Amino acid sequence: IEADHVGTYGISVYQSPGDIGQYTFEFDGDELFYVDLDKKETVWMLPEFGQLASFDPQGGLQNIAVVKHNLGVLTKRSNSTPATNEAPQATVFPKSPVLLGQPNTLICFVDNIFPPVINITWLRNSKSVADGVYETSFFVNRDYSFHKLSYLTFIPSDDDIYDCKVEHWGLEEPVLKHWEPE
Amino acid sequence: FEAQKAKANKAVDGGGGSLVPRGSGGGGSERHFVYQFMGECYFTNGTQRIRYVTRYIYNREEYVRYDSDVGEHRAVTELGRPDAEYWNSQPEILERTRAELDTVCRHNYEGPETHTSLRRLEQPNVVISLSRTEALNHHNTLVCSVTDFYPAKIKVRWFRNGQEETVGVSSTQLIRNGDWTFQVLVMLEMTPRRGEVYTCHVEHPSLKSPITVEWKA
């Protein structure tokens, strides 16, 4: 609510089926960094940022344990009521203007994701391409749902085309968001 | 600068109370459970008025909370009561949280956040183009792209070989890209005529002076 800058910290998410965890720090809608729970290390999104600030990775692991604990409880304390699935959206768009031959990044914005278990796949003329592909941590939404981003590093050409493929237990079948320079 | 983390308090025993039916859902899912904690703390006017709010969400419902303008944990829903009371009784628990407004918030703003977020100035790229299918018919659009900028406060304006034009002007919304940079598109419905010089005026993010790009004749 009413406030210039907003610092979202210690965001700890955990999912019962699957021992699935995510620990993140956000600022004004932007990810400061996330802690790999496996590698056990702070990963900043802006490497410049990492060189000026630091975070102890054990803090994040430490919080997941709590979150992990707390879940079971509420789970119990709640006659084991499952979470209701939702239908996510999808918007694709280029980082910068299309200019054939010149490197560009295709962005696939997904919002209203819940639960935080989604599959996002890039399709180049129907060819599940994987490489030069990047993805972001789940972002917090007001209604406690989420939204994630995927990035496709590509070379534009007025011939081939693309299609961001989204799969979520909330959609009867994969949603296809088509984008093309033409 | 080391950033401080907001801590989550443990949920009391939690016997496993049977929460009578409500308004669930279905028609295409499975059995899943999601927990969420976050130490959101609101800044305004420098670090003069902070407000710390820790929320614990079950599935997708905030069940317990801690507001800084309350000074204690308040159950947002019945299944919170257990937690709200216990945490409000332990000085070890409630006084530590009560302290995050400075240790886990004023600290971060003044420390990491100022030497990082608050100093992020990325100047915007700008170039104009020609769209709207073919020429004179009802189609002749000029698009000025303002990309890869940050912070978000920005102002973009069109100009017809002289004055500011507002009619037939359309600009997208903010459009975050996820990587700490913004981009906003500004279209202009027009007709090119000999000698006409259109220009796009952009300003703020990191320009000590409002930049301008011309689209000759």
Ligand SMILES: *[C@@H]1O[C@H](CO)[C@@H](O)[C@H](O)[C@H]1NC(C)=O
């Ligand atoms: C996501 O990919 C995994 C990999 O096998 C698969 O098991 C799961 O069903 C997929 N979920 C969807 C539909 O997004």
Ligand SMILES: *[C@@H]1O[C@H](CO)[C@@H](O)[C@H](O)[C@H]1NC(C)=O
């Ligand atoms: C607990 O869950 C069982 C199984 O869904 C349900 O039948 C029962 O109504 C719940 N407990 C209560 C409040 O009776």
Ligand SMILES: *[C@@H]1O[C@H](CO)[C@@H](O)[C@H](O)[C@H]1NC(C)=O
């Ligand atoms: C409060 O101070 C900040 C300085 O960072 C300024 O941006 C803001 O305009 C001031 N209050 C308002 C909203 O007028």
